[PDB]
From Swiss-Prot:
It comes from the Bacteria. NCBIfam families: PRK09474.1 (NF007011). GO terms for molecular function: carbohydrate transmembrane transporter activity; maltose binding. GO terms for cellular component: ATP-binding cassette (ABC) transporter complex, substrate-binding subunit-containing; outer membrane-bounded periplasmic space. This is Maltose/maltodextrin-binding periplasmic protein. InterPro entries: Maltose/Cyclodextrin-bd, SBP, SBP_1_CS. PANTHER family: MALTOSE-BINDING PERIPLASMIC PROTEIN, MALTOSE_MALTODEXTRIN-BINDING PERIPLASMIC PROTEIN. Belongs to the bacterial solute-binding protein 1 family. The complex is composed of two ATP-binding proteins (MalK), two transmembrane proteins (MalG and MalF) and a solute-binding protein (MalE). The keyword Magnesium does not apply. SUPFAM superfamilies: Periplasmic binding protein-like II (SSF53850). The gene is malE.
Amino acid sequence: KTEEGKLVIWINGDKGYNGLAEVGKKFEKDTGIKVTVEHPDKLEEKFPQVAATGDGPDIIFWAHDRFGGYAQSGLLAEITPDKAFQDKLYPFTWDAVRYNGKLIAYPIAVEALSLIYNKDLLPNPPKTWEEIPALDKELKAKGKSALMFNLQEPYFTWPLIAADGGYAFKYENGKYDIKDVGVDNAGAKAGLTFLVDLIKNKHMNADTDYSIAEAAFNKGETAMTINGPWAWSNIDTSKVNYGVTVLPTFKGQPSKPFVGVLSAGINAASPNKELAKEFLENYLLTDEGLEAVNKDKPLGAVALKSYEEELAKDPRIAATMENAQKGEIMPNIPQMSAFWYAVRTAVINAASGRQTVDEALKDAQTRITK
């Protein structure tokens, strides 16, 4: 039974330079509230090493997948809810942030992507995706392109082959089956086959690099750029208007890309539970500290119906809200990491010239399981 008067924060994508700067000093100002502002970068690998000691600090924000799903085995204490829940909380948010009937994680950051569109240099029916690829005919017909992006990255092919009906793993409620995979079907096959025609009908050789494709996204002068809140290079007070819209449908069904929520939590050794719940409930959960990090400057939407209700002005929470309703939550299984060996042999190997999608993709399923 020991008590202390200090807490260390850990943020990796919150930013808030001036925001947290004030709130931190304002508390100690009373007569006993000192918070240490720290931010990680590569500590992701040190965690399992520096954790074996018992977790020094006790304040860190990270997505819910590797927070409420991994901590459940390491050393993370559950959180207690207040009246903000009964008040009017989005059931679609907490209903998914449950594990073994326990709430050992809370979301306080939405990370995801938008579909970029060009001011008015792309007239067409945004009801069909196929309308996009054809845009190259009229665009290239002069000396430009309506779309430009990578081709061998897990940010385009996957989201493109997902709008067909190709599942990855069997996840119900909050657990997996054993060998239930939805890749050895007609949905995944037809999706991997279409992606190949695009590369041949566009580059006809696939010679697009990062510096080559970066040229387009850099000047965003083409109706195809994919970016997120945590992938912007150099802010700079620009003066160019950009259009943010959500992806259409394919064949009749949308695609399943990435949705992200940051779960907050403390180690199963936090001092004073009542003092923690009180300090945190009024720290990063009120106009006192919240406005600091989410009002100094808007960037991420919060899990509050009351706040978002005025939030109608910000297009971050609104635009992403479209895909969120019809999207899939990131994975939380270690076996899924094996798929990396699949995508390389499926697209890369098959794109070489001595690998057929039949034996490459189909046989790949049986290999992963055995």
